[model samples]
Target: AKALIVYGSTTGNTEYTAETIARELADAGYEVDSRDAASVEAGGLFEGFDLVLLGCSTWGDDSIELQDDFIPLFDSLEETGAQGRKVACFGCGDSSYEYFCGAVDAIEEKLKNLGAEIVQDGLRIDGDPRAARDDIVGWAHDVRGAI
Candidate 1:
């Protein structure tokens, strides 16, 4: 399978999480292209990709906020040609906040509206992602199996 990982991280938690998922995907015989959300173009970003994974860290005290770099791409997802594409979302957040992993929820909702097939529920890892390596690994397996 061909996969794309697009991530926006402030504290590196989401980036490390993406790497772990990429490692698992590569081990599963997938050709994975991982990119920072900052470097990726918003238009047709998922073109030719068999699966797309989006990761970002949540922000805000009372409302949901997406990482800075991801906001542009998130806003222009209508041009991403996501219709019928396999997609999943993951993010790092603190559960003590009002909107835990809100970025994941927002991205998933957008993908659904764009007609993308969400293969798995959004992975909301609270705190450092390294602490949830097992969960990440398991989530990667589930995503791989779904595609």
Candidate 2:
């Protein structure tokens, strides 16, 4: 199976999480293509992938806010050929925040509305994701299982 990982991280936690998921997927023998959301365009991005994983850290004071670079892609996801494709989401945020990991929730909802099948529940990491390596790896395993 093939996998695409697109992530937007400001404080580096989400990036590290994405890399960990990539490494786990690679070790599992899936062909993995990981990219920074800042460098990826939205349209037709999911055409040939067996699975798509999106990660973005949440940021905001009064409400949920997606990582800056991911906003465009999130806004244009309906044009990404996501319909009927398998997808999962993950994100990093502080539990202290009012909308912890809200970006993950937002993206997952969007994917669902775009007709994408959510094969697994999203992974929402509170605090440093580096400290939650096991959780990330476990979620990756689950995602691979869905593939």
Model 1, poorest ten-residue lDDT window? 37-46
lDDT of 1 by residue, 116-142 (tens): 999999999998888999999999999
RMSD of each: 0.6, 0.7
lDDT (Cα) of model 1: 0.94
TM-score of each: 0.98, 0.98
Count clashes in each candidate, considering only residues at least 3 apart in sequence or on different chains: 0, 0
Evaluate model 2: give its TM-score.
0.98
